[PDB]
Design a binder for this molecule. Structure first.
Ligand SMILES: *C[C@@]1(O)C[C@@H](/C=C/C(C)=C/C[C@H]2CC[C@@H](NC(=O)/C=C\[C@H](C)OC(=O)NC)CC2)OC(C)(C)C1
Ligand SMILES: [Zn+2]
Ligand SMILES: [Zn+2]
Ligand SMILES: [Zn+2]
Lengths: 862, 842, 65, 93
């Protein structure tokens, strides 16, 4: 049977990578434009209730790499500049009447894709809206000039080249130079020296520079004027207000430092980042800022800079008539690590977290009249120490809204664990202390979250007790016992240098909540792992096992054994001293636990050592199948350890997952695609009998039948590969046929064939690392397939993607599309104008309402 | 060697004609000689010569100096026989040498401005652009103080020409360096105590700054207005006029923002309205008219009511410039929010139509266009009838220019606002006046045709009673000695056919069509095309059975008309034949359709695009009509019979049949002709396959498998052109079926295309590379990298050359996609090569 | 073509090609959001720290020749 | 005759084609499916070359377009497609 699927997003992506604020409606109200990755969304936080409403959401069918807002002189509405994975730059204007993003301009300059020398990664606009600049990570950058016409409509000019070969750009930001010629500050670095010195000296000798590009308007050209080398490498720049309301210049954020610099007769004013007092992290680890914000008022202006630990500091500069004397930092608050922050007018702060839920707070105290110690750059500093501060709970901010975000989803199981007619989606997601297992029920989804201790890797379901057996593992983290030992060692070090006897007692008594203050994580090859047994109904953990400070869990499976009775067992694969980059692991251990009290407690039966990391554990006909490195072994339960009875060695690189149906086993390779291996019981050997013709960085897999396997890429793809007919699993040299290919634009870590509504069509549901949920529904007739295919074709040309990308090229990112119709694009038929709808429907010999009903009929059969 | 010299180039480059040695040449004189040579290579030379000479003259500009450089460049720029592109090249070299010689040009600035400033007043737009560009580059090179010093003495000059030129150049240097950099100088000069010429020149500078920079002024509009506002109450009259005109220019530039910057100017202008007269009054009115559309609704109403007394008074002015100014002011006032429609109807419209709408206004063309556009803008707000009824009776007038004026006015009004506001009395007046204006025309003014068509289409079904009255006039007009009037009547039929059909008067249209049928023997081709278009418009709206003449009689009459050499006749005849074939195919035998199709094939290679478009559309229509087989047999016969470009029409027609009828009705017979051993016809079959797949695009997704054997046979050593055309077929297939599950057969054809990658002949290897790129987009860059890695690094150097060319094409084609497709490269002892991030597991 | 960085010829060494594809991979990571998410989940670091480490690796992603 | 493409960074100027070469594509000489509009750099559009034919260099009559095939292969994302002859100056013809 030919496989033709209809792709539909049930739950849109909920993570956020970019967020900007401004008056996009043309009124005094300030909204927020966010990038969900391949989605552009508009949010309006109501200043009366303190809640964020979603007004518009648009699938752009691209990779939004940059997003900024600007405004012309005397203008009342803010435009939206977007740099995509296309070779184009787009300028959009939100129209509140039609409730749409109107593409005002779209200019092409390069090839598509997240390329190395094609602009789109960095975007920087002049603070007066006179010119924008779009730059790549290497070489070329382009400057467009923005103006208005007699009808007050925005006009864009031809690009202006600002290219420089062999130059790596860290970050670009515009400079507020009032109404002089616009200027753009770049953090650049030249690597031409490092590539011609076979000794490596030029590599360590090359240093990051801060460069300035001036756009001469009278001469209409971009010139690279200044280029000063920097002491230490900076990660990004902050545009300080300039002109008549502030001193122009830039703030370079480095590692453990922040430096004001400005061209002309201006000294460099650097200030060390105030480290947290009694920091439980590693002393050799540095501290950097992850994001920033700027709030300008007629009175003053300040910046909000968040650290790696979540500490938001308020930064103010002392004017000193025209040259800044000092940079003043003070501890503002502590929120989860954010990808962007927006200090809205009327007193509200939007925190778009890098993972997990997002937050909206109200400001009450700007930190002006407080007893907390404010830090400056003029204070004497030995360079062997840094400034210390004490973190305290929220006092300047109050939680007014929390937006739910499933990102990042690491595992998902769709099943009816509670005794209801409709199954539920159990999603193990979150990161670190903010991880969670969430139950989702539809009847859009409604969720309930139960917090977890570390980042869950994979969880299995106990068939007899319906309880969930999760493994949680995090890198460079401390276990509970090692955390207590570290606090004890710090208290011991503290009693010598006599208020410290009481201070160390208070330190041991105060346990900072890691869900709000982050987790004290340090070291390189350190690992924190926890096995948990949870009830799907309630939020209670039925059992918990902590592991070694260097033991990291990566696999789990519950199974009965033919060697013993119906009593269940739990096998957990663990690596020791992994050291991810560069890779150099020590050994591995398989925990074999007995399952007692009908799935409520774990009995440590034994630990079996093994060469490398057990990355996959799956039951297989009484015994068990385990993948260690590139070796696929079969184990049977022993009285004291796991006994090996057979192994296969010719696996290509490294096993990342195995699943079995009948006497076949599908080994997923980390880089190569799936491998079909056959196990002959009497011969007691594993023989590879099929592989694939395409390398695929597999993340998950799901066997649809005896011959087909549906898998997901690390690069955001879904493939379906089937064995050819008349394939006897005794002879080798068999190649499998790729019968379906599709690009979701988001990395998928869980594929499962199931049926959401009872009795309906069997579909294939996938989860998204960016917090999304999608489905692929098979087609029933060639009439419906041809109809939806022509709908897709017509919408590709009549309603092209919003950010310059080409839809067919986008869905063909890494492999050409094979037998998948994009329903996310087809449903945009309702968003077109009536003229185009009528024309396309007449091309299909039916009416626009008939097409809308035909589209809506699919969102009931899933 | 030395490039070619025109006659006028001798005067500037004679010294280079003699072959003397530079060792004998005196110094400094020798550097001037090298300048003379570099400029010859710049002006007359190939692009490589030009770029090399530009680089050489810029990198050595400092060593040469400003003196000899400009003393050599300026006489060339003033050459009377200097081409515009040569002037542009000189402008570019001047900019590039000014960037290097920073401040050395300060002594020469004056000697530059005596040469460059005449370009700012040149009629050539690009000459003014070039002059402004080099003045800007000069103002960036030398300091602001240098420019102000060099140009200050010419401010209070006695002549007005030099004052105007200096003001324009000052505006240019302002746009070059920025408004705030010139703000103190302007503030000082606009209040000069010495003479009034200085303040007049400063105000002119501000006006030209406005005109030159437009919306880029809004940041400094308040400053400019505060600097220039004192000039409205000055004692001198010319300075008041120029201050008003500069305020008008600043308002026009800042539209629609920045009204608050003119807060100090409203009352002065308001008083001057009642104080001044003549040219100063005209300037004040112009400034007010450009300032009003910037105001709020209530204040716009207030100010307009305040100025309207004198505005109406100035309607009956003897000055023509005053008339144009007040007409523009009326158009600006009545097009703003705040000026209510009833107010305009009461106070503005009566004097407007009394004084302005006069016969002599339709004589001068500028006044004609101004009054027409202003009246249309008036109707846009006060209503269509309230404007049309006031000049509808002028459609019956003795002076034809006035009739043309009122006709164009009514036409634009009704084309903008429809005909919903027109009552029955006004409808009868419109019909009567339009019939009289059309009936009496000295010549066939197209404005009359457009007005008739627009009014008829706007009335729609309401023109039903007047339809016999119109058709009688049209019939009487078709029987005219003048051909260009018969074609105008035919065009009117073309434009009113749809309304005549809506009015349920198919008998009248049938009479029109049977009258047109006897006119197909018109000796003048343009009238023939017009009547063909009229017949097409009649056929496209009436059923085929009801149409007179019967289609069975009309189409054989149309068949020989395709042989006409005129583009219009061909286009309209083909369009009519296609409209017939689309719905009246049953009324024509297959033999007539075949004869038309064979007389229509030559028109596939017409030079005009529209003719080919129409030919293709009507060929598709007749192919849907007849059926693929009868025409396709003779198509294959003609294909084997003829060669050269004439056959390309056969190829295109085969593709048209394959697209209209499904391609399964032509592909088997098309592949059969590949069996005969003649090498000349197999190439034609391959060309047909190539264009067929390129034309059908995605439709060929169900036919790659069927053609794969013929291709794999043609990819073998049958001939060079065989494999070239087969690779072309593979390219068009891959690009067409891209994204529709054809990876199997295309990956198979790749195995036959690949061995031809080691070919020296240029055209066939180019076709092979095109096929390889098409297969890259269709199969994916992964398979291409898989086939490329096996030869990317090879002991043979030619193998490495070819495979690296392939890899470069793949890389430029899809670099981002290759990340997931690179193989494992184990790190050796001296470097790290494994990408560890891609090995992480969650 | 010499304009497009990353292309090659018959004398392109193994080190040149590998450092080209390593820089291309790093830019692809910086661009595609979920790739960066995966990398920041595997090793516990902030997205900003991961981007900074990649930009630092841009110098000699493989080592000196 | 040694001709080539301009291949400079194209601007906001719309490409233009004369009556001789109207429906033809600037890159591959095809008349099938005009897709994306042709952009050219400012230097090729300046002065007396405003609205000039991109292929030959005569009075242009209609906008120039790449074909669907060249759009698919992204041959429009290259430089300016203006044909320039390296064996002449700015005054020849
Ligand atoms: C600049 C130029 O090269 C232009 C050529 C002109 C060549 C011509 C007119 C060749 C005849 C050729 C035309 C195309 C073929 N038919 C065809 O494509 C038909 C229909 C197409 C699909 O429809 C459209 O394009 N519609 C808009 C027939 C053969 O002349 C010179 C002087 C060489 C200069
Ligand atoms: Zn060009
Ligand atoms: Zn031409
Ligand atoms: Zn083309």
């Amino acid at each position: 049977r030919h496989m033709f699927l209809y792709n539909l997003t049930l739950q849109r992506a909920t993570g956020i990578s970019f967020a900007i604020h401004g008056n996009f409606s043309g009124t005094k109200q300030q909204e927020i434009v966010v990038s969900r990755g391949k989605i552009l969304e508009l949010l309006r936080p109501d200043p009366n209730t303190g809640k964020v409403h979603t007004l518009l959401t648009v699938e752009v069918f691209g990779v939004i790499r940059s997003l900024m807002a600007f405004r012309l002189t005397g203008g009342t509405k803010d435009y939206i500049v977007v740099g995509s994975d296309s070779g184009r730059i787009v300028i959009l204007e939100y129209q509140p009447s039609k409730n749409m993003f109107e593409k005002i301009h779209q200019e092409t300059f390069g090839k598509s894709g997240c390329r190395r020398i094609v602009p789109g990664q960095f975007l920087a606009v002049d603070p007066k809206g006179r010119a924008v600049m779009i730059s790549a990570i290497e070489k070329q950058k382009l400057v467009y000039i923005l103006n208005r016409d007699a009808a007050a409509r925005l006009t864009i000019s031809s690009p202006l080249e600002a290219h420089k070969a062999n130059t790596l750009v860290y970050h670009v930001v515009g400079v507020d130079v009032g109404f002089e010629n616009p200027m753009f500050a770049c953090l650049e670095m030249d690597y031409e020296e490092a590539d011609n010195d076979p000794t490596g000296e030029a590599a360590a000798n090359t240093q990051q520079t801060l460069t300035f590009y001036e756009l001469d308007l009278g001469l209409n050209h971009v010139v690279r004027k200044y280029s000063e080398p920097l002491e230490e490498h900076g990660n990004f720049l902050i545009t300080v207000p300039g002109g008549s309301d502030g001193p122009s210049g830039v703030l370079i954020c480095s590692e453990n430092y922040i430096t004001y610099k400005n061209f002309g007769d201006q000294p460099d004013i650097r200030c060390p980042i105030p480290r947290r007092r009694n920091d439980l992290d590693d002393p050799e680890r540095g501290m950097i800022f992850v994001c920033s914000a700027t709030h300008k008022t007629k009175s003053m202006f300040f910046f909000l800079a968040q650290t790696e630990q979540g500490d938001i500091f308020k930064i103010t500069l002392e004017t000193d008539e025209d040259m800044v004397t000092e940079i003043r930092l003070k501890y503002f608050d502590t929120v989860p690590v954010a990808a962007a922050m927006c200090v809205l007018k009327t007193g509200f702060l939007f925190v778009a977290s890098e993972f997990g839920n997002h937050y909206l707070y109200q400001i009450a105290h700007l930190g002006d009249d407080d007893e907390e110690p404010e830090f400056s750059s003029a204070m004497p500093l030995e360079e062997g120490d840094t400034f210390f501060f004490q973190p305290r709970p929220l006092k300047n901010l109050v939680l007014v809204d929390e937006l739910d975000s499933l990102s990042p989803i690491l595992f998902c199981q769709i099943a009816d664990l509670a005794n209801e007619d409709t199954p539920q989606l159990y999603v193990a997601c979150g990161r670190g202390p903010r991880s969670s297992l969430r139950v989702l029920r539809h009847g859009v989804f409604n969720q309930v979250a139960f917090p977890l201790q570390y980042t869950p890797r994979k969880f299995v379901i106990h068939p007899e007790s319906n309880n969930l057996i999760i493994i949680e593992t995090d890198h460079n983290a401390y276990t509970e016992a090692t955390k207590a030992q570290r606090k004890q060692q710090m208290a011991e070090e503290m009693v010598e240098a006599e208020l410290a006897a009481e201070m160390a007692a208070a330190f041991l008594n105060e346990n900072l909540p890691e869900s709000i203050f982050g987790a004290p994580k340090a070291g390189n090859g350190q690992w924190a792992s926890v096995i948990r047994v949870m009830n799907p109904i309630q939020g209670n953990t039925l059992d918990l096992v902590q592991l070694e400070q260097n033991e990291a869990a990566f696999s789990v499976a519950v199974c009965r054994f033919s060697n013993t009775g119906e009593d269940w067992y739990v096998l957990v694969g663990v690596a020791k001293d992994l050291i991810l980059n560069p890779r150099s692991v020590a050994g591995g251990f398989v925990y074999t636990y007995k399952l007692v009290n009908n799935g409520e407690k774990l009995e440590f039966l034994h630990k079996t050592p093994v060469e490398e990391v057990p990355a996959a554990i799956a039951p297989f006909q009484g015994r068990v199948l385990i993948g260690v490195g590139k070796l696929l072994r079969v184990y049977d339960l022993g009285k004291k350890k796991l006994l090996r009875k057979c192994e296969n060695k010719h696996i290509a690189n490294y096993i990342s997952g195995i699943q079995t149906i009948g006497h076949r086993v599908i080994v997923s390779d980390v880089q190569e695609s799936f491998i079909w291996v056959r196990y002959k019981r009497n011969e007691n050997q594993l023989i590879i009998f099929a592989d694939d013709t395409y390398p695929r960085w597999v993340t998950t897999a799901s066997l649809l039948d005896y011959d087909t396997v549906a898998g997901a890429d690390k690069f955001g793809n879904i493939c379906v590969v089937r064995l050819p007919p008349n394939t006897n699993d005794e002879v080798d040299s068999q190649k499998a046929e790729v019968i379906m290919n599709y690009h979701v634009g988001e990395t998928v870590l869980s594929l499962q064939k199931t049926t959401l509504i009872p009795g309906g069509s069997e579909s294939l549901v996938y989860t998204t690392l960016s917090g999304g949920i999608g489905i692929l529904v098979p087609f029933t007739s060639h009439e419906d397939h041809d109809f939806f295919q022509h709908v897709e074709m017509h919408l590709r040309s009549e309603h092209p993607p919003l950010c310059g990308r080409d839809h067919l090229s986008f869905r063909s990112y890494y492999f050409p599309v094979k037998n998948v119709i994009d329903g996310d694009l087809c449903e945009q038929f309702n968003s077109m104008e009536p003229n185009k709808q009528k024309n396309v429907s007449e091309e299909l010999d039916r009416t626009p309402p008939e097409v809308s009903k035909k589209l809506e009929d699919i969102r009931t059969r899933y | 060697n030395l490039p070619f010299l025109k006659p006028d180039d001798i005067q500037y480059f004679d010294k280079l004609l003699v072959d003397v040695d530079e060792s004998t040449l005196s110094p400094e004189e020798q550097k001037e000689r090298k300048i003379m040579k570099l400029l010859l290579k710049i002006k007359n030379g190939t692009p490589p010569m030009r770029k090399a000479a530009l680089r050489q003259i810029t990198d050595k500009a400092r060593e040469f100096g400003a003196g000899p450089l400009f003393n050599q460049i300026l006489p060339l720029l003033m050459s009377p026989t200097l081409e515009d592109q040569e002037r542009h090249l000189l402008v570019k070299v001047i900019d590039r040498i000014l960037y290097k010689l920073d401040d050395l040009v300060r002594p020469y600035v004056h000697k530059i401005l005596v040469v460059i400033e005449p370009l700012l007043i040149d009629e050539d737009y690009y000459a003014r652009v070039e002059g402004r560009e080099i003045i800007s580059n000069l103002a960036k090179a030398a300091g602001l103080a240098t420019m102000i010093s060099t140009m200050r003495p010419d401010i209070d000059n006695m002549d007005e020409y030099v004052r105007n030129t200096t003001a324009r150049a000052f505006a240019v240097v302002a746009s070059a360096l920025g408004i705030p950099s010139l703000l103190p100088f302007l503030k000082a000069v606009c209040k000069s105590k010495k003479s009034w010429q200085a303040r007049h020149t400063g105000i002119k500078i501000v006006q030209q700054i406005a005109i030159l920079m437009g919306c880029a002024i809004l940041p400094h509009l308040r400053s400019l207005v505060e600097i220039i506002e004192h000039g409205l109450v000055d004692e001198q009259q010319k300075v008041r006029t120029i201050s008003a005109l500069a305020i008008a220019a600043l308002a026009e530039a800042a539209t629609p923002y920045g009204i608050e910057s003119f807060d100090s100017v409203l009352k002065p202008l308001w008083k001057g309205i009642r104080q001044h007269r003549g040219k100063g009054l005209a300037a004040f009115l112009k400034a007010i008219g450009y300032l009003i559309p910037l105001m709020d609704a209530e204040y716009a109403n207030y100010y307009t009511r305040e100025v309207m007394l004198i505005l109406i008074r100035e309607f009956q002015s003897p000055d023509e410039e005053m008339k144009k100014i007040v007409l523009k002011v009326v158009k600006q006032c009545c097009g703003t929010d705040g000026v209510e429609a009833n107010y305009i109807k009461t106070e503005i419209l009566p004097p407007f139509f009394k004084h302005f709408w006069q016969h002599r206004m339709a004589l001068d063309r500028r006044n004609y266009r101004q009054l027409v556009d202003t009246t249309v803008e008036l109707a846009n707000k006060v209503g269509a009838a309230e404007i049309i009824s006031r000049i509808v009776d002028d459609l019956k007038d003795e002076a034809e220019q006035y009739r043309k004026m009122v006709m164009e006015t009514i036409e634009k009004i009704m084309g903008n606002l429809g005909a919903a506001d027109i009552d029955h009395k006004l409808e009868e007046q419109l019909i009567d006046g339009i019939l009289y204006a059309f009936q009496e025309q000295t010549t066939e003014d197209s404005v009359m045709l457009n007005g008739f068509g627009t009014v008829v289409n706007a009335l729609g079904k309401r023109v039903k009673p007047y339809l016999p009255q119109i058709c009688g006039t049209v019939l009487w007009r078709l029987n005219n000695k003048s051909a260009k009037v018969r074609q105008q009547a035919a065009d009117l039929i073309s434009r009113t056919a749809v309304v005549m059909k809506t009015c349920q008067e198919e008998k009248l249209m049938g009479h029109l069509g049977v009258v047109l049928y006897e006119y197909l023997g018109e000796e003048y081709p343009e009238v023939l095309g017009s009547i063909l278009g009229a017949l097409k418009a009649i056929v496209n709206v009436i059923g085929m059975h009801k149409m007179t003449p019967p289609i069975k009689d009309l189409l054989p009459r149309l068949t020989p008309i395709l042989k006409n050499r005129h583009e219009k006749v061909q286009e309209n005849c083909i369009d009519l034949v296609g409209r017939i074939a689309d719905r009246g195919a049953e009324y024509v035998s297959a033999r007539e359709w075949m004869r038309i199709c064979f007389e229509l094939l030559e028109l596939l290679k017409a030079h005009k695009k529209a003719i080919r478009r129409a030919t293709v559309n009507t060929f598709g229509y007749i192919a849907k009509a007849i059926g693929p087989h009868d025409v396709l047999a003779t198509l294959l016969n003609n294909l084997k019979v003829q060669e050269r470009q004439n056959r390309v029409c056969t190829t295109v027609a085969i593709a048209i049949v394959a697209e209209t009828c499904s391609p399964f009705t032509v592909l088997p017979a098309l592949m059969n002709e590949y069996r005969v051993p003649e090498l000349n016809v197999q190439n034609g079959v391959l060309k047909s396959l190539s264009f067929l797949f390129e034309y059908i695009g995605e439709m060929g997704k169900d036919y790659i498998y069927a053609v794969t054997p013929l291709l794999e046979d043609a990819l073998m050593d049958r001939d060079l052109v065989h494999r070239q055309t087969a690779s072309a077929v593979v390219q068009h297939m891959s690009l067409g079926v891209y994204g529709f599950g054809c990876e199997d057969s295309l990956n198979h054809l790749l195995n036959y295309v690949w061995p031809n990658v080691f070919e020296t002949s240029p055209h066939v290897i180019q076709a092979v590379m095109g096929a390889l790129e098409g297969l890259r987009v269709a199969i994916g860059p992964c398979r291409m990298l898989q086939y490329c890695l096996q030869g990317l690094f090879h002991p043979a150097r030619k193998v490495r050359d070819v495979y690296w060319k392939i890899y470069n094409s793949i890389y430029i084609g899809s670099q981002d996609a290759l990340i997931a497709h690179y193989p494992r490269i184990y790190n050796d002892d001296k470097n790290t090569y494994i990408r560890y991030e891609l090995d992480y597991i969650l | 073509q010499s304009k497009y960085i990353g292309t090659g010829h018959a004398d392109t060494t193994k080190w040149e090609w590998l450092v080209n594809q390593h820089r291309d991979s790093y830019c692809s990571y910086m661009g595609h959001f979920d790739l960066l998410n995966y990398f920041a989940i595997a090793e516990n670091e902030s997205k900003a720290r991961v981007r900074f480490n990649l930009m630092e690796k841009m110098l000699q992603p493989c080592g000196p020749p | 005759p040694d001709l080539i493409f301009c291949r400079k960074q194209a601007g906001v100027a719309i490409g233009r084609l004369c009556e001789k070469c109207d429906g033809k594509c600037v890159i591959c000489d095809s008349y099938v499916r005009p897709c994306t509009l042709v952009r050219i750099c400012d230097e090729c559009n300046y002065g007396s070359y405003q609205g000039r034919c991109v292929i030959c260099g005569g009075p242009g009559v209609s906008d120039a377009y790449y074909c669907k095939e060249c759009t698919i292969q992204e041959k429009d994302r290259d430089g300016c497609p203006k044909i320039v002859n390296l064996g002449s100056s700015k005054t020849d013809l």
